[PDB]
Design a binder for this molecule. Structure first.
Ligand SMILES: Nc1ncnc2c1ncn2[C@@H]1O[C@H](COP(=O)(O)OP(=O)(O)OP(=O)(O)O)[C@@H](O)[C@H]1O
Ligand SMILES: [K+]
Ligand SMILES: [K+]
Ligand SMILES: [Mg+2]
Ligand SMILES: [Mg+2]
Ligand SMILES: [Mg+2]
Ligand SMILES: [Mg+2]
Ligand SMILES: [Mg+2]
Length: 153
RNA sequence: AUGAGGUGGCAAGAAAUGGGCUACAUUUUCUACCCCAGAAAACUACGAUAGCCCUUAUGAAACUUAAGGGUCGAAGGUGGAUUUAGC
């Protein structure tokens, strides 16, 4: 267990946990992550029968900013960037897991590129005739949004 | 006039056959990208560089030649005997 950590609460992760994997319970995978996890990481959860996420500095830095958030000031925009496959998505998921366990309302868009390509039913909107609706993309997200924030809706 | 010039015209397809091109698809089709993606995937799929219509390019001259677009969505579902090429 040299690569694992017994601290499964993302609110208690610190620099001493860097490089160590913490476990995400199956209950949180169903509620917090009905979507957003990388497709290949989802294959690993099915194969290893567990979801373990390495604690890294990008997420630790961002967790430090969110724990000191001044909710009176306007919302701050944090942007994760880096080369392909460096762990941008999973760093975001580690932060989503922190706020989910702090009773925040999670508005998670797992992949915004899916809303600008490969749309079969692109209907015209009735609320605004100059805009287009996307019933399949919108209904899919509503189902996952309901699963994550069911206790607040 | 078996020579010279002018005007207009033929150069088609019952059929057979040689070579080639494109396909019959999932190691595929479309898009992004040029290789860590998203979709498509059987009668609105794959599949025409064919047919029909229009535009454009060249030209004095274009149903005719070429390019592009629209429309159209066929045979084909991997091919018998035989046979070609490659160290
Ligand atoms: N924190 C982590 N814990 C465990 N595995 C990780 C972690 N970060 C990255 N990985 C591994 O790297 C892979 C890629 O991670 P991820 O998809 O988050 O990267 P990314 O930079 O967002 O990728 P892309 O550039 O494609 O959007 C994961 O599927 C996993 O195998
Ligand atoms: K042939
Ligand atoms: K053949
Ligand atoms: Mg990512
Ligand atoms: Mg004569
Ligand atoms: Mg078709
Ligand atoms: Mg044509
Ligand atoms: Mg002209």
């Amino acid at each position: 267990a040299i690569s694992r950590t017994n601290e499964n609460d993302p609110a208690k992760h610190g620099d001493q946990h860097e490089g160590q994997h913490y476990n995400i319970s199956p209950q949180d995978l169903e509620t917090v992550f009905p979507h957003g996890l990388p497709p290949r990481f989802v294959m690993q959860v099915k194969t290893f029968s567990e979801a373990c996420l390495m604690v890294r500095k990008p997420a630790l830095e961002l967790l430090h900013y969110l724990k000191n958030t001044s909710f009176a000031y306007p919302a701050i925009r944090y942007l994760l960037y880096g080369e392909k496959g460096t762990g941008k998505t999973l760093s975001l998921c580690h932060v989503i897991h922190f706020c989910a366990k702090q009773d925040w309302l999670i508005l998670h868009i797992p992949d915004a590129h899916l809303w600008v390509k490969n749309c079969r039913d692109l209907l015209q909107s009735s609320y605004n005739k100059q805009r287009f609706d996307q019933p399949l993309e919108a209904s899919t997200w509503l189902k996952n949004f309901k699963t994550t924030n069911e206790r607040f809706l």
